[PDB]
Design a protein around this ligand. Structure first.
Ligand SMILES: OC[C@H]1O[C@@H](O[C@H]2[C@H](O)[C@@H](O)[C@H](O[C@H]3[C@H](O)[C@@H](O)[C@H](O[C@H]4[C@H](O)[C@@H](O)[C@H](O[C@H]5[C@H](O)[C@@H](O)[C@H](O)O[C@@H]5CO)O[C@@H]4CO)O[C@@H]3CO)O[C@@H]2CO)[C@H](O)[C@@H](O)[C@@H]1O
Lengths: 720, 70, 90
C-alpha cells in the first residue's frame, strides 16, 4: 500500500495560472520590443537607465517565476505506517534516528531554552531503543553541562507523564505557558492531580536551573570544579580536550516506572590554539562522526536550540516518507516548514516569511524538492557521507576520503546501520574521543566534498545544492501542525543582521567555486528548472543594484527631467494597461491556490524592497570588496533614510513647481508623482516603526511638522 | 458611480449641482453595504487591506485612461 | 487618612505593609499612621494588618521580592519566577 500520496494541483487553479503567466510574459516581451524600438523620450541617459533597469527587472522576474511552475502537494499516512511496519506482536522494524542539537554559548542564550528543546527531543513518540539525542557545545561551559545534568532528572520525572497523557507541545515551558483550555479532550480520570504535581515539579526545576545560571556568572580564579572534586577540562575555551558523556541511556538512569529513556550524548570537541575551527560546519560534522561511532543511525534529524518539536509525530512522518521502497529510495532529506510563534497582530517586521515557505517551496517541490535551510531536516547518513542515489541514476581510498580512523570506516561501510561489534562500550567511548580529535580533518575530504560544505558564513544551501547535484531528491512535507516551532527575533537589528548575513552568504557562494552558472555540468543529474531556481536563489541580491537606481529615478525625473515617456492612446497606454492588469490578476490567481492572505504578499514585497534598498546593497558591496581582496543598524539605515528624504523633498518641490505653472502638467504631474508615491508608500511604513514608538499611531506631531514645512516651501516659492 | 463620475468630468463643469445629488445617494448605499461585505471577504475588521486600495486607484486609472482614449 | 468610606482601607493597609517591609534596620525605621475621621474601621484594619505584617515581613525580607505591597505584587502578570534562586521559594 502507498504510505504517502503526492497529488498535484487539482488543475482547476493550475492551467489558468499557466495561461495568465504566459500572457504576462508575452505582454512584457511586446512592451520591451516597443520600448526599445519606437520611443526616444528626448533624453538619452535617463531613458537608457530606465530601460536597462526595467530589462534587468524583467530578467529577474522571468527567472524567478518559472520555478513556481507545477506546484505539488503531499500527504502521509501514519495509520498505515504503524499498521505495516510496527508489526504488533513481533519486534519493531523501525529505523533509528539521531537528533542533533548544537549550542554556542550559554550567556548569549539562556540554557533554559536548550533544556526545553532537549526535553522535547527526549519526549517524542518513537521507540526508546531507536531515537537517540546528541547535544554539542562549542563554548565548553560548565553551566551547560550542569543544566543538562539537571535536565536529565527533570526528563526522568517528566517523560512518563507526557507519554502517558499524550500532551502537546512536549516542551514544558512552551506548554505550561499556554492560555488555551488545557482540559479540552482529556479523558484520563486522574489527569488534574498529576498535572498539578508535575507543574509544581517543573517550577522547582526552573528554580534550580535559575540558581545554576546565577551561580555560573561568577568565575573563581582557581577555575571551575566539578561536584566529584575534579578540575573542569574545559577551563580555557581556546585550549581544552574534547569530552564525551552519556546520560539517560541504557547504562545510566531509568524512568520511575522502570522503563528506559533515550540516550543523550553530550560531546565537546577538542580545540587548540593555531588550529582552524569552523563555526557550525565543524560541529555538526563532528557530531555525525561521533554518532557514526556510538550509535550508527541511518537518519540524522538536525535542529537548533530555539526550535523545538511541536507534535510528537514529525519522526513518524519522516519514517513514512523515507520507508517506502518507491518514494523512499531516492529521498535524501525531508525538509519541514519552520514556523514561528509569539507574533503580534501587526506583523510589521514580516518575520513570518511564509509566502516563500508555501508558495515558492511547494512550487519547487514538484521538480527536485526544497533546499536545506538549517533546521528540521532528516538527512540520510549515506547521502551525507556521499555515495549517490542507490541504483543510480580501495582501502587506502577509503582512508583518504573518510579519515585515518579504521573504526569509523568499518562502521560506515554498513548500509543497515547499528554497531557491529556490539561490545566494549568503554572502548567505543575512547574510540569516539579519538575520532573527535582536532587533527582528524587535515587532508581528508571532510567538508570539502563530503559533509557540511565548508564556507565562510553560509553553508546550508551550499550543502543542499552539492548533494542535489549528485542525483539525490528531497521531499517537502507540511503537517497540519507545524511540528517544528521555535522562537523568532522580535527586534529589528537582529532581523537586519540576519538578512545581511544571508545576502553575504549568497554573494560568497556566487563568487566561490560552487557557482551554479558553471558548476555541476558534468553527468547531468540536475534538472534544468532546478538549476534555474538555484540561480535565482544565488543571484537574488544582485537585483538590489538596479533596484536602488530605479527607485532613485522618479526623484530626478520629477525635478530635473520633468518627463517620463510620451503617451500614445492607441498602443502605449494599452500596453501599460495590459501589464498593470496582468500583474494584479496573476497575483490574485496565484494567491487563490496557496491559501495566503492578500495582505501577506504586499507586506512581503515591501519588505523585499526594503532589503534590496539597504541589506542587499551593503551585502553586495561587501562581496565585491571581499572578492577584490581575495556594520551597525544605523549605518544600514543610511540608504533608506537618504532615499526617503530625497524622494519626499523632490516630490514636494516638483509639486510646487508644477503648481506655479499654468495647468500644463495635468497629465505629466500625475504620471511623475505616481511612481514617487509608490516608492514612498513602500518605504515609509518601515522607517516609521523604527523611528516611532508604536505602529498603531505613528504620531500627530509629524503631521503638524509636515504641513508647516509644506507651508514653508509654498511661501518660499511665492516669495522667490 | 465611477463610470458616471468620469462621464461628468468630460462635461464642461455643467454637473456641479446634479452630480453631488446623484453621487450622495450612491455613497449612502455603498457606505452602509461596504462594511459588511469587507469583513466576510476580509481577514480582519481592524484593517481591511492596503492592496485593494492599490487596485482601486489603479482601476480608477483604468477607467480614466480608457475614457481619455475612447 | 481622611475617611475609610471614600477610599477602602485595603489600600491603606497595603501602603502600611509596604512601609513596614522596607530594607532598613528595624531599630531605625518607624511608621506613623494618622486619621482625621477617628473611625473604628481603620483601627481594626490596622490591627489585622499588624498580624498580616508579622506573617509577611520575614518572607519578603528573606526572598527580596518587589514590590513590597501584596495587593500590587500578587496581581502582576510578569513572570514571578524570573531570577529567584531560593530552593523552597514556590
Ligand atoms: O526563509 C529562510 C531562507 O531564506 C533564503 O533567502 C530567500 C528569502 O528567504 C526569500 O524571502 C527570498 O524571496 C524573495 C526573492 O529572493 C526575490 O527574488 C523576490 O523578488 C521578486 C519580488 O518578490 C516580486 O514582488 C517582484 O514582482 C515585481 C515584478 O518583478 C515587477 O516586474 C513588477 O513590475 O512588479 C512586481 C511587484 O509588484 O519580482 C521580484 C523578482 O523579480 O521576492 C521574494 C520575496 O517575496 O529569496 C531568498 C533566496 O532567494 C535564504 O537563502 C535561506 O538561507 C534561508 O534559510
Amino acid at each position: 500500500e502507498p504510505l504517502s500520496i503526492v497529488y498535484p494541483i487539482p488543475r482547476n487553479k493550475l492551467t489558468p495560472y499557466r495561461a495568465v503567466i504566459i500572457m504576462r510574459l508575452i505582454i512584457l516581451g511586446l512592451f520591451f520590443h516597443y520600448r526599445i524600438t519606437n520611443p526616444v523620450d528626448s533624453a538619452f541617459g535617463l531613458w537608457l537607465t530606465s530601460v536597462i533597469c526595467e530589462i534587468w527587472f524583467a530578467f529577474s522576474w522571468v527567472l524567478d517565476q518559472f520555478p513556481k511552475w507545477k506546484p505539488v502537494n503531499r500527504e502521509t499516512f501514519i495509520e498505515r505506517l504503524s499498521a505495516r511496519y510496527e508489526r504488533e506482536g513481533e519486534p519493531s522494524q523501525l529505523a533509528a534516528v539521531d537528533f542533533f542539537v548544537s549550542t554556542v554559548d550559554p550567556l548569549k542564550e539562556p540554557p533554559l531554552i536548550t533544556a526545553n528543546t532537549v526535553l522535547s527531543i527526549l519526549a517524542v513518540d518513537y521507540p526508546v531503543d531507536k531515537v537517540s539525542c546528541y547535544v554539542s557545545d562549542d563554548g565548553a561551559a560548565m553551566l551547560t553541562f550542569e543544566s543538562l545534568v539537571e535536565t536529565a532528572e527533570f526528563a526522568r520525572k517528566w517523560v512518563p507523564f507526557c507519554k502517558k497523557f499524550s500532551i502537546e507541545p512536549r516542551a514544558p515551558e512552551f506548554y505550561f505557558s499556554q492560555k488555551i483550555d488545557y482540559l479540552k479532550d482529556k479523558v484520563q480520570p486522574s489527569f488534574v492531580k498529576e498535572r498539578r504535581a508535575m507543574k509544581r515539579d517543573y517550577e522547582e526545576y526552573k528554580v534550580r536551573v535559575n540558581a545554576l545560571v546565577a551561580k555560573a556568572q561568577k568565575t573563581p580564579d582557581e577555575g571551575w570544579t566539578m561536584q566529584d572534586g575534579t578540575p573542569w577540562p574545559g577551563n580555557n575555551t581556546r585550549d581544552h580536550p574534547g569530552m564525551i558523556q552519556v546520560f539517560l541511556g541504557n547504562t545510566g538512569a531509568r524512568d520511575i516506572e522502570g522503563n528506559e529513556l533515550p540516550r543523550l550524548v553530550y560531546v565537546s570537541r577538542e580545540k587548540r590554539p593555531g588550529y582552524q575551527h569552523h563555526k557550525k560546519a565543524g560541529a555538526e560534522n563532528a557530531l555525525v562522526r561521533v554518532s557514526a561511532v556510538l550509535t550508527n543511525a541511518p537518519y540524522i534529524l538536525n535542529l537548533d536550540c530555539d526550535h523545538y518539536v511541536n507534535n510528537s509525530k514529525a519522526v513518524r512522518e519522516a519514517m513514512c516518507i523515507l520507508m517506502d521502497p518507491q518514494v523512499g529510495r531516492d529521498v535524501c532529506y525531508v525538509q519541514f516548514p519552520q514556523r514561528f510563534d509569539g507574533i503580534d497582530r501587526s506583523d510589521r517586521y514580516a518575520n513570518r516569511n511564509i509566502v516563500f515557505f508555501d508558495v515558492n517551496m511547494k512550487g519547487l517541490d514538484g521538480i527536485q524538492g526544497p533546499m536545506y535551510v538549517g533546521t528540521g531536516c532528516v538527512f540520510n547518513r549515506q547521502a551525507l557521507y556521499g555515495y549517490g542515489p542507490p541504483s543510480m541514476p580501495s582501502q587506502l581510498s577509503f582512508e583518504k576520503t573518510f579519515g585515518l580512523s579504521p573504526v569509523f570506516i568499518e562502521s560506515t561501510l554498513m548500509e543497515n546501520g547499528g554497531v557491529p561489534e556490539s561490545a566494549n562500550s568503554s572502548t567505543l567511548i575512547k574510540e569516539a574521543i579519538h575520532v573527535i580529535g582536532c587533527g582528524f580533518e587535515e587532508k581528508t575530504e571532510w567538508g570539502k566534498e563530503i559533509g557540511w560544505i565548508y564556507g565562510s558564513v553560509t553553508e546550508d544551501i551550499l550543502s543542499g545544492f552539492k548533494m542535489h547535484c549528485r542525483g539525490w531528491r528531497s521531499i517537502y512535507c507540511m503537517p497540519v501542525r507545524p511540528a517544528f516551532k521555535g522562537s523568532a527575533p522580535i527586534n529589528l537589528s537582529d532581523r537586519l543582521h540576519q538578512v545581511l548575513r544571508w545576502a553575504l552568504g549568497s554573494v560568497e557562494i556566487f563568487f566561490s567555486r560552487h557557482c551554479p552558472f558553471w558548476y555541476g555540468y558534468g553527468g547531468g543529474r540536475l534538472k534544468w528548472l532546478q538549476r534555474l531556481a538555484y540561480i535565482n536563489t544565488i543571484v537574488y541580491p544582485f537585483t538590489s543594484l538596479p533596484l536602488i537606481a530605479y527607485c532613485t529615478i522618479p526623484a530626478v525625473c520629477l525635478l530635473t527631467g520633468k518627463f517620463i515617456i510620451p503617451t500614445l492612446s492607441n498602443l502605449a497606454s494599452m500596453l501599460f494597461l495590459g501589464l498593470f492588469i496582468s500583474i494584479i490578476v496573476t497575483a490574485v490567481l496565484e494567491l487563490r491556490w496557496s491559501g495566503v492572505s492578500i495582505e501577506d504578499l504586499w507586506r512581503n514585497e515591501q519588505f523585499w524592497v526594503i532589503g534590496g534598498v539597504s541589506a542587499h546593497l551593503f551585502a553586495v558591496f561587501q562581496g565585491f570588496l571581499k572578492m577584490l581582496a581575495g556594520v551597525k543598524w544605523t549605518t544600514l539605515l543610511i540608504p533608506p533614510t537618504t532615499l526617503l528624504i530625497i524622494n519626499i523633498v523632490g516630490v514636494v518641490a516638483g509639486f510646487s513647481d508644477a503648481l506655479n505653472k499654468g495647468y500644463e502638467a495635468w497629465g505629466p504631474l500625475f504620471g511623475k508623482v505616481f511612481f514617487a508615491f509608490w516608492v514612498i508608500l513602500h518605504l515609509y511604513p518601515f522607517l516609521k516603526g523604527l523611528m516611532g514608538r508604536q505602529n498603531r499611531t505613528p504620531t500627530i506631531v509629524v503631521l503638524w511638522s509636515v504641513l508647516l514645512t509644506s507651508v514653508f516651501s509654498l511661501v518660499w516659492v511665492k516669495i522667490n
